[PDB]
Amino acid sequence: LVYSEAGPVALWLARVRWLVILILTGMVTSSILQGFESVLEAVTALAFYVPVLLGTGGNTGNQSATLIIRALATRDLDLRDWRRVFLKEMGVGLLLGLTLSFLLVGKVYWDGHPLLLPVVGVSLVLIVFFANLVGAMLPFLLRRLGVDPALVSNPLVATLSDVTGLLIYLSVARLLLE
Amino acid sequence: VYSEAGPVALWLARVRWLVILILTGMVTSSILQGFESVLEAVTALAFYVPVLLGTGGNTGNQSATLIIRALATRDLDLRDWRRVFLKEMGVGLLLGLTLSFLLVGKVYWDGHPLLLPVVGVSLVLIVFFANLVGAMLPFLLRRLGVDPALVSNPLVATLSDVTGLLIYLSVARLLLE
Numbered sequence: 001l002v003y004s005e006a007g008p009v010a011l012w013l014a015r016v017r018w019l020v021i022l023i024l025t026g027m028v029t030s031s032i033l034q035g036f037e038s039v040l041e042a043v044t045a046l047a048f049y050v051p052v053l054l055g056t057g058g059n060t061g062n063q064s065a066t067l068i069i070r071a072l073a074t075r076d077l078d079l080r081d082w083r084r085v086f087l088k089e090m091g092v093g094l095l096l097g098l099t100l101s102f103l104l105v106g107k108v109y110w111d112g113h114p115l116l117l118p119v120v121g122v123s124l125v126l127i128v129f130f131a132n133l134v135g136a137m138l139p140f141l142l143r144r145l146g147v148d149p150a151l152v153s154n155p156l157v158a159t160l161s162d163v164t165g166l167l168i169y170l171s172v173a174r175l176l177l178e
Numbered sequence: 179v180y181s182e183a184g185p186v187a188l189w190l191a192r193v194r195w196l197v198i199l200i201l202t203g204m205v206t207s208s209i210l211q212g213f214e215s216v217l218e219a220v221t222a223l224a225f226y227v228p229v230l231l232g233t234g235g236n237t238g239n240q241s242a243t244l245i246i247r248a249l250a251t252r253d254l255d256l257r258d259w260r261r262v263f264l265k266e267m268g269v270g271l272l273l274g275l276t277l278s279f280l281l282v283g284k285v286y287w288d289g290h291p292l293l294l295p296v297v298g299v300s301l302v303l304i305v306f307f308a309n310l311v312g313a314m315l316p317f318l319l320r321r322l323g324v325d326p327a328l329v330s331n332p333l334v335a336t337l338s339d340v341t342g343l344l345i346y347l348s349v350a351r352l353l354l355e
């Protein structure tokens with residue numbers, strides 16, 4: 001589609017379907033949170049860190065994904081190299097997790113919620129770790145399924161990290177505060 | 179190149195950008211803290227935070243993708259940003275009303291009637307503003323000589339999380355308190 005020649009109505013028609021699919025899939029997060037209503041009610045400040053946790057996961061995943069998409073498209077990597085990449089990214093994700101978690105724990109202490117220092121600290125490490133792997137592996141999976149990663153990698157990694165991020169954080173919270 | 183670098187080298191190359199983003203993203207926790215009153219009154223408010231901020235990010239990044247492409251192929255010039263701004267005003271409102279209709283349905287299903295106008299109004303505003311942010315950012319970056327490929331997407335997502343939260347919680351406080 002040519003942007004400069006497309007009217008508002010035309011742009012809406014070309015954009016809406018992808019957004020509808022994403023928000024329908026995104027509604028899952030609201031159901032997840034409802035299933036943890038007990039823990040959310042128990043500790044008020046638990047909800048304060050959801051956007052930065054899910055957002056950091058998304059940032060990490062889309063960073064590693066972009067690196068992989070480029071590496072494959074430039075033939076620096078091949079589809080057969082996914083295992084060696086996986087093993088290497090386990091280390092990178094762990095190192096990134098520890099670094100970012102160290103900072104966020106500082107914020108939690110600043111905000112004055114010492115009860116949440118362990119749950120937030122552990123959760124972000126796990127979230128960065130898994131989001132980094134999802135980001136590194138998705139371009140391989142997409143390519144093998146016939147669709148190039150460049151077109152749809154961003155919203156997929158963002159949605160998956162949101163779902164998996166909520167599940168990790170709230171589960172860690174339920175085990176440590178109950 | 180990727181096949182070259184080891185784990186520490188990759189960590190070295192990635193950490194600075196992620197640190198800047200999280201230091202920026204930390205503001206969201208401070209924003210939510212400032213609305214603790216209404217959050218405590220209606221706990222269900224927290225249920226729709228990720229889907230609201232996430233839809234804003236999706237909208238913004240979809241918009242940014244189109245603009246980056248048009249600038250690369252010279253379908254648009256740098257000075258066209260005002261005309262793009264005015265047109266995207268309409269597109270965002272149309273996408274906002276469409277997506278809002280769906281999410282209100284989810285709220286109606288979940289059984290939180292108090293949040294029907296809160297979530298409905300917020301999503302329209304969130305989509306509307308996130309769309310403009312996504313459309314304008316490539317103009318700003320190219321003006322500063324920055325390549326969007328590894329910068330545009332995390333920036334839109336973080337800006338939308340902050341602005342989206344400010345909209346949602348302000349509407350919540352207004353309608354519930």
Ligand SMILES: [Mn+2]
Binds near residue numbers: 037041
């Ligand atoms: Mn309850």
Ligand SMILES: [Mn+2]
Binds near residue numbers: 040041042043044218
């Ligand atoms: Mn409570």
Ligand SMILES: [Mn+2]
Binds near residue numbers: 211
């Ligand atoms: Mn507090």
Ligand SMILES: [Mn+2]
Binds near residue numbers: 055058231
């Ligand atoms: Mn996000």
